[PDB]
Design an enzyme around this catalytic site. Structure first.
Site, PDB file in Angstrom:
ATOM      1  CE  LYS B 533     -30.739  24.303  33.351  1.00 23.67           C
ATOM      2  NZ  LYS B 533     -31.221  23.406  32.267  1.00 23.67           N
ATOM      3  NE  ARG B 534     -30.919  31.001  24.833  1.00 23.60           N
ATOM      4  CZ  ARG B 534     -31.599  31.358  23.744  1.00 23.60           C
ATOM      5  NH1 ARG B 534     -31.776  30.484  22.758  1.00 23.60           N
ATOM      6  NH2 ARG B 534     -32.122  32.578  23.650  1.00 23.60           N
ATOM      7  CE  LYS B 539     -34.244  26.774  30.379  1.00 22.01           C
ATOM      8  NZ  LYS B 539     -34.672  25.433  30.831  1.00 22.01           N
ATOM      9  CE  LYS B 645     -29.026  17.107  25.755  1.00 20.07           C
ATOM     10  NZ  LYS B 645     -29.036  18.542  25.585  1.00 20.07           N
TER      11      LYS B 645
HETATM   12  C1  LIG Z   1     -29.834  19.715  25.771  1.00 18.19           C
HETATM   13  C2  LIG Z   1     -29.536  21.039  25.397  1.00 18.19           C
HETATM   14  C3  LIG Z   1     -30.330  22.096  25.826  1.00 18.19           C
HETATM   15  C4  LIG Z   1     -31.537  21.922  26.779  1.00 18.19           C
HETATM   16  O1  LIG Z   1     -31.408  22.595  28.063  1.00 18.19           O
HETATM   17  P1  LIG Z   1     -32.332  22.230  29.310  1.00 18.19           P
HETATM   18  O2  LIG Z   1     -32.848  23.578  29.600  1.00 18.19           O
HETATM   19  O3  LIG Z   1     -31.365  21.633  30.234  1.00 18.19           O
HETATM   20  O4  LIG Z   1     -33.366  21.272  28.898  1.00 18.19           O
HETATM   21  C5  LIG Z   1     -30.024  23.374  25.449  1.00 18.19           C
HETATM   22  N1  LIG Z   1     -28.952  23.653  24.675  1.00 18.19           N
HETATM   23  C6  LIG Z   1     -28.140  22.642  24.247  1.00 18.19           C
HETATM   24  C7  LIG Z   1     -26.909  23.019  23.490  1.00 18.19           C
HETATM   25  C8  LIG Z   1     -28.419  21.326  24.589  1.00 18.19           C
HETATM   26  O5  LIG Z   1     -27.593  20.326  24.129  1.00 18.19           O
HETATM   27  C1  LIG Z   2     -41.192  26.329  24.156  1.00 19.29           C
HETATM   28  C2  LIG Z   2     -39.948  25.541  24.516  1.00 19.29           C
HETATM   29  O1  LIG Z   2     -38.880  25.848  24.006  1.00 19.29           O
HETATM   30  N1  LIG Z   2     -40.094  24.514  25.396  1.00 19.29           N
HETATM   31  C3  LIG Z   2     -38.960  23.735  25.897  1.00 19.29           C
HETATM   32  O2  LIG Z   2     -39.035  22.445  25.246  1.00 19.29           O
HETATM   33  C4  LIG Z   2     -38.161  21.381  25.710  1.00 19.29           C
HETATM   34  C5  LIG Z   2     -38.371  20.138  24.802  1.00 19.29           C
HETATM   35  O3  LIG Z   2     -39.711  19.617  24.865  1.00 19.29           O
HETATM   36  C6  LIG Z   2     -38.462  21.107  27.216  1.00 19.29           C
HETATM   37  O4  LIG Z   2     -37.637  20.045  27.727  1.00 19.29           O
HETATM   38  C7  LIG Z   2     -38.232  22.415  28.029  1.00 19.29           C
HETATM   39  O5  LIG Z   2     -38.554  22.201  29.405  1.00 19.29           O
HETATM   40  C8  LIG Z   2     -39.096  23.593  27.455  1.00 19.29           C
HETATM   41  O6  LIG Z   2     -38.769  24.818  28.118  1.00 19.29           O
END
Ligand SMILES: *Cc1c(COP(=O)(O)O)cnc(C)c1O
Ligand SMILES: CC(=O)N[C@@H]1O[C@H](CO)[C@@H](O)[C@H](O)[C@H]1O
Ligand SMILES: O=C(N[C@@H](Cc1ccccc1)C(=O)N1CC(C(=O)O)C1)c1cc2cc(Cl)ccc2[nH]1
Ligand SMILES: O=C(N[C@@H](Cc1ccccc1)C(=O)N1CC(C(=O)O)C1)c1cc2cc(Cl)ccc2[nH]1
Ligand SMILES: *Cc1c(COP(=O)(O)O)cnc(C)c1O
Ligand SMILES: CC(=O)N[C@@H]1O[C@H](CO)[C@@H](O)[C@H](O)[C@H]1O
Ligand SMILES: Cn1c(=O)c2c(ncn2C)n(C)c1=O
Ligand SMILES: Cn1c(=O)c2c(ncn2C)n(C)c1=O
Ligand SMILES: Cn1c(=O)c2c(ncn2C)n(C)c1=O
Lengths: 793, 795
Positions: B533-534, B539, B645
């Site tokens: 994730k980012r 996080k 996912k």
């Molecule tokens: C699904 C997805 C995310 C979302 O990350 P979460 O923080 O787990 O919700 C971010 N980047 C990519 C490439 C994804 O496919």
């Molecule tokens: C501002 C922003 O990028 N919000 C992000 O949006 C996704 C999609 O709704 C959420 O799943 C996530 O927790 C949240 O950090």
């Protein structure tokens, strides 16, 4: 190939390629669908042609130029492939007007004028003759600006020609290449190393060049600048624009040198990419290995713009391929040929060595060495004459040191040519005397030419058909066949048919004029035309004086029989060219007074043809009766517009300059309206001293014109608006406008006389057209092939 | 299936020839990819034209998803699958002697999004098309998407994502719909009303990308706008200055959950908003139209506050252009707009300085003021006394430099406001915007996020999709809830072996990737522990990092003590300006280098920082995951979707009761997930009291060591104080209470290890997660938005 199948292909592209149906399809959509339909007919021969060059390895010719004034591609392509008539029928059957679709296509105006259009005509000719030729330039995001007139003045608008996409270009990502800039030089024990450089990528785009009815399709490869991929993040990404600004826009200067660093970058950019692409191709073919290079490769330098190619090739052979200097230099001279396109001091390229040192360090060193070996020779052959060393040096010392690129082209080339007899002569015996005395056989002439496909078959189908019905279609590939036309000089009917063609062209072009401009056009009047880039040397000013002249004669004696004329003057002026802009304002001011004076009426109309470009030249040229080619003797290297008008049925009024001299020779001087001083008269007037205030004092008609222009008759709201023009005419006119005024006007009076005698006028027209064969660019390239490139069709 | 492969083959050769100008001897792999893409693309045309023609003829209410982001990933395979052509194309490519996998990898990802927010928009588009809704995506066509990330000397390095360099066959320029957008200028108050004059103009050129529904012939549109300078001292310079207008859609702001008050960014926001509203209005007028029916034909979803300016822009068009009275227009506006809150993190709240706005969008600042005036006049009338409520409900923030609270503008300007998971929607409604919901209770709603089962199951994990299909049919692809039917196999060991095999094949295929990209040697029998994730502090990739080290110190403690082997994968990009995030990356790579090369640890543990995490890569590592790390502090993750996912792809989740984790637990059974740590209430209690990170450090041996190692140079010898900023944050500025959840997290992980040594029980728990993931299909989410917000039905 047949009509029914062309309709299906068109509908197939409208659907799958434009994602449209007839209810939502735009005009642009139809044009793109037609364009793709025609484009498919080239693929087979394009792959086949390039594959053939690889398998047989004929000597290759590379035309290297910063400019390619291509105009539109659709119609040209349909004609050379023999599809026009079929497409015209298919489109018509689909409920559309092919002519309207054609107007959608943007001009590929990657040129300024002649120099760029010559290159374009050459590719067509080289493809028609079946040569393994390649054109190499820059894919400018913006070409020559689009011109508009607001309040009588030229206004510039970016020519965003790629905005809607270009179907005629093909990206070749696998051939991308890096071009270096800046950095420093390192002379190590493993060779010289040019390091710590700034890199810019060059992405090539290929455009097919189809020959006329021969199954040959060559390539025009244009390079695009792209940022490499390897502080604030956002700014950094945005800063990628800097590199990409290299192939952003074409410098809008015709015959004028602007020493801008960006231009220097464009010159090297196109040069480094091209030479690396040619070397790669060379090494990729069936081939110390380089000894056969000059036998497989010929590079033509279009003017000095790509002069850096000489040291770039040297750089490659020595630092990359590890060849010794002596050998590298030999191959280079055998590879390059230089075409000088001008003698105007202001057009000469002289780059400050300081600028070159910073941007191209390794190239400065190579240019210095080239000059050393060059001057050591002179010193040997002329131990005394040290002033000769100064005059032949690649470096100019007076004040801030500069590099004479023309000198650089002469020494690194095995052939140098002017573009017309009188020009080449002046280049060989006068401007480069010191060089031709040592290497006489190096200098030659290669008189310019224009392609009879675009400039006859495409722009004037009516005339091509008339000619074809009388002597066959043989002339399209061998224009000297037009001489058979002399067989019909006394054929009254063929003369009436010749005239009808011109009149139809005039009636159609008239509809264009009443549609674009308010003015009412006298379709029977004489179409007096001067269209070319606005310049003091070309003298649109002289023409303007004659118009005001005619206007006064009319006001003076309204009841005096006057042969009606529609004077058309058009052309773009370089943005920073003040005198050119002022000249445009003058013309527009005159037209306003002329076109709206009740006393003159349908006797005289004046039009400043806006946005003069290739597609517009194709419309007005076939519609012209009188072509103005009046630049000061010795100032026009050649000219090509003059040839266009000659091939399309117009008579010429001009000076013995450029190719005008050769037109008179081919058709016979009496069949042209020559006037004014000649190369020798202008020189005499110079040695003596040109005092313009004398002709003004000795010619009342000229004085009236001058006073009107100086006192505000043409600018009441701004009495001194044309002060700068008057000032230049009386004290700073290097083109002696007042000196040819009297001869010009008397010449113009004879033209009017002849115009009133249709039989006589058209008879002369026929002799001109019959004598135009010499000016086909196929003949020009034929002489280039035999005497410089040593290649065969 | 007859004559379908043969025609695909013919067509393919036709395109390589006419479209790529190549023959089989000179064609590059990229040419083969483009040839296949055009071949696939031709099958969308008929339906795309037909679909849009249908929406014109039947006039169903249209939904407009307005977002600054759309993280689309690759289009090729997705298009082939939704159109039912994959099998036939695979067979055509094979017969032609080509490797289809080699071709698909050529395609560049359209990464016009930062993370979960942009990816949600993508998933929503796919679902809306699958449900046959008259939906349209609206965003910006960035020349440069999210940057490509590389690791140089352990640090993150950013490289421009020039995704359009070689061309995108999936987009279709629509030049006839170009529009002008205005910036700067000033406001003139004349008798003909208010006029916005002296403006600089920029053009908006839309580009449509087809969005194929799954097996239903519907093909929707995603329209992205590109900035162009309009044609109208120094000539050359003037022409070069055209880059300035075009810079507006040059690159995607690489910030995730973080507000950066840049002018260019504000320009992008207004740009997509002005182009979009004008185009939507033009479409409305061209259909069987005055504006009274607008809200009944148009629904515009505002993805977070980024497109907030759409509210005052519509008011501007309605009042200054269409001459409607204010009252009527405000009414049409609220009925048209709906707002989705995607975060409660203070650093992510957009608050623009009134000065920047006045200078750039003067007419809009006047309209925002007027909306605020009306808005506050209402509060005053309802609560004559409470003056503080005015301050808490005003669109303008006065403290210091006046700023605009875009969240508030969206609320008053919308008829519906929603969160993205039960816990977050409750927080938004009852805490953050408490004063607002009290007045308009029904306005706030919840819309649990979802992911599309096509890209995240059928495409990325063909092994599992087929496995499941052989057991319960294909029906589940259009109705994920059908996955509960897998329960019938709770006892079938044969099935559990099969489930483990598929997971095994995915890890083996992904291991090839890893070892080829990294020097490290993978132990394919190890547990794949993943956190992708980012990079964010909230996080908590740090926490995870504290665990990896805690483990490292255990193996070195007893090299013969039974250790459940693990291959720990932590990936994700860090926003360029996010210093702490970049430090965390350097700490993870340093640790990795020490663990991966320690001879005594061997095949027991390996750390891999997965470079350049992006949609295409996610499709790779996700199916290969055994354990999913979803450990954000309670109350910080509005929802998360990665969690979904992983759940859908056969992995177990270890995490906090945050975002959609809570709902995943409710669906699969809290004991079928490894929940741990403080809960929203536990966090509040700790705040009220006061967080003293030093205590847990003082009271936790295993922890004290990990820290002393980080602060003393064990992982950075050449640079002993390298991680100072991290230690100093963990001790005196940790808003995400890392240590506070360290003890619970470590004990939780040990249980994961325990369960992993038991194949039968591990896979049994997994089966329970896959059968309960149906609620997280974006098709369910979209259906709920349609019924309760947009009020539309499956066209
Ligand atoms: C699904 C997805 C995310 C979302 O990350 P979460 O923080 O787990 O919700 C971010 N980047 C990519 C490439 C994804 O496919
Ligand atoms: C501002 C922003 O990028 N919000 C992000 O949006 C996704 C999609 O709704 C959420 O799943 C996530 O927790 C949240 O950090
Ligand atoms: O770009 C497509 N066709 C092309 C067709 C084209 C190609 C070259 C020049 C002009 C037109 C197109 O419309 N343009 C390329 C131009 C640009 O570079 O902006 C404009 C296209 C067709 C199509 C069909 C489907 Cl189903 C999906 C996406 C699609 N794109
Ligand atoms: O550009 C052509 N095809 C296109 C085909 C294409 C279209 C969309 C995405 C990828 C490939 C092409 O090669 N590119 C568009 C990309 C760009 O703009 O950089 C690269 C093309 C075919 C063709 C055929 C003839 Cl005869 C002459 C010119 C031609 N160009
Ligand atoms: C042919 C042509 C020229 C060259 O004209 P000269 O009169 O030779 O200077 C310039 N511009 C255009 C558009 C042309 O077609
Ligand atoms: C520098 C330059 O543009 N030169 C131009 O070249 C063309 C083509 O040779 C000539 O016809 C013309 O007279 C001359 O002015
Ligand atoms: C032809 N030309 C130009 O094109 C020009 C100029 N000065 C500026 N420009 C651009 N001058 C003096 C000039 O003769
Ligand atoms: C547009 N324009 C010019 O381009 C110009 C000028 N005076 C000189 N020039 C060149 N004026 C008054 C003017 O309006
Ligand atoms: C999430 N985030 C960022 O994305 C960020 C930042 N500082 C700069 N950036 C880019 N901070 C403090 C932050 O929390």
């Amino acid at each position: 190939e047949n009509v029914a199948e062309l309709k299906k292909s068109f509908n197939r592209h409208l659907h799958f390629t434009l994602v449209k149906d007839r209810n939502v399809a735009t005009t642009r959509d139809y044009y793109f669908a037609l364009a793709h339909t025609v484009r498919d007919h080239l693929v087979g021969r394009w792959i086949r042609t390039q594959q053939h060059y690889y398998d047989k390895c004929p000597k290759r010719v590379y035309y290297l130029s910063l400019e390619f004034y291509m105009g539109r591609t659709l119609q040209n392509t349909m004609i050379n492939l023999g599809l026009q008539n079929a497409c015209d029928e298919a489109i018509y059957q689909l409920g559309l007007d092919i002519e309207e679709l054609e107007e959608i296509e943007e001009d590929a105006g990657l040129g300024n004028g002649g120099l760029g259009r010559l290159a374009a005509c050459f590719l067509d000719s080289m493809a028609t003759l079946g040569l393994a030729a390649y054109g190499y330039g820059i894919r400018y995001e913006y070409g020559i600006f689009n011109q508009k007139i607001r309040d009588g003045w030229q206004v510039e608008e970016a020519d965003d020609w790629l905005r809607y996409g270009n179907p005629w270009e093909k990206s070749r990502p696998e051939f991308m290449l890096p071009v270096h800039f800046y950095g420093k030089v390192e002379h190590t024990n493993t060779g010289t190393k040019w390091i710590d450089t700034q890199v810019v990528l060059a992405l090539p785009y290929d455009t097919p060049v189809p020959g006329y009815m021969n199954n040959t399709v060559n390539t025009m490869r244009l390079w695009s600048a792209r940022a490499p991929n390897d502080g604030d993040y956002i700014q950094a990404v945005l800063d990628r624009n800097l590199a990409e600004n290299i192939s952003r826009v074409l410098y809008p200067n015709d015959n004028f040198f602007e020493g801008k660093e960006l231009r220097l970058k464009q010159e090297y950019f196109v040069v480094a990419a091209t030479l690396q692409d040619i070397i790669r191709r060379f090494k990729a073919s069936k081939f110390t290995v380089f000894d056969a290079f000059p036998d497989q490769v010929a590079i033509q330098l279009n003017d000095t713009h790509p002069a850096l190619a000489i040291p770039e090739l040297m750089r490659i052979f020595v630092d990359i391929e590890k060849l010794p200097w002596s050998k590298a230099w030999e191959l280079t001279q055998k590879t390059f040929a230089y075409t000088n396109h001008t003698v105007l001091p202001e057009a000469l390229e002289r780059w400050p060595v300081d600028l070159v040192e910073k941007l191209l360090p390794r190239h400065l060193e190579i240019i210095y060495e080239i000059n050393q070996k060059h001057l050591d020779r002179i010193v040997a052959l002329f131990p005394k004459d040290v002033d000769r060393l100064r005059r032949m040096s690649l470096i100019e010392e007076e004040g801030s040191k500069r590099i004479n690129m023309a000198h650089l082209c002469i020494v690194g080339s095995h052939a140098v040519n002017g573009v017309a007899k009188i020009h080449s002569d002046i280049v060989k015996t006068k401007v480069f005397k010191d060089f031709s005395e040592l290497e006489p056989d190096k200098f030659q002439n290669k008189t310019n030419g224009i392609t009879p496909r675009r400039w006859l078959l495409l722009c004037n189908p009516g005339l091509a058909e008339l000619i074809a019905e009388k002597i066959g279609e043989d002339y399209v590939k061998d224009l000297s066949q037009l001489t058979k036309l002399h067989s019909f000089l006394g054929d009254d009917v063929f003369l009436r048919e010749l005239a009808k063609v011109k009149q139809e062209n005039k009636l159609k072009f008239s509809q264009f004029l009443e549609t674009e401009y308010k003015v009412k056009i006298n379709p029977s009047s004489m179409f007096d035309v001067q269209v070319k880039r606005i310049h003091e040397y070309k003298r649109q000013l002289l023409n303007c004086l004659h118009v005001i002249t005619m206007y006064n004669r009319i006001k003076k004696d309204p009841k005096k029989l006057f042969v009606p004329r529609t004077v058309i003057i058009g052309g773009k002026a370089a943005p920073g060219y003040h005198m050119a802009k002022m000249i445009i304002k003058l013309i527009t001011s005159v037209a306003d007074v002329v076109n709206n004076d009740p006393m003159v009426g349908s006797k005289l109309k004046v039009i400043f043809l806006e946005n003069y470009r290739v597609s517009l030249a194709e419309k007005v040229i076939p519609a012209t009766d009188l072509s103005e080619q009046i630049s000061t003797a010795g100032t026009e290297a050649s000219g090509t517009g003059n040839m266009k008008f000659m091939l399309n049925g117009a008579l010429t009024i001009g000076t013995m300059d450029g190719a005008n001299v050769e037109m008179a020779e081919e058709a016979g001087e009496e069949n042209l309206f020559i006037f004014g001083m000649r190369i020798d008269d202008v020189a005499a007037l110079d040695k003596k001293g040109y005092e313009a205030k004398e002709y003004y004092e000795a010619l009342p008609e000229l004085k009236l014109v001058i006073d009107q222009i100086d006192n505000g008759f043409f600018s009441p709201k701004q009495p001194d608006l044309f002060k700068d023009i008057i000032n230049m005419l009386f004290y700073h006119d290097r083109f002696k406008v007042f000196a040819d005024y009297e001869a010009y006007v008397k010449c113009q009076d004879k033209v009017s006389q002849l115009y009133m005698n249709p039989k006589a006028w058209n008879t002369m027209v026929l002799k001109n057209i019959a004598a135009s064969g010499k000016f086909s660019s196929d003949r020009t390239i034929k002489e280039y092939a035999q005497n410089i490139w040593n290649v065969e069709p």
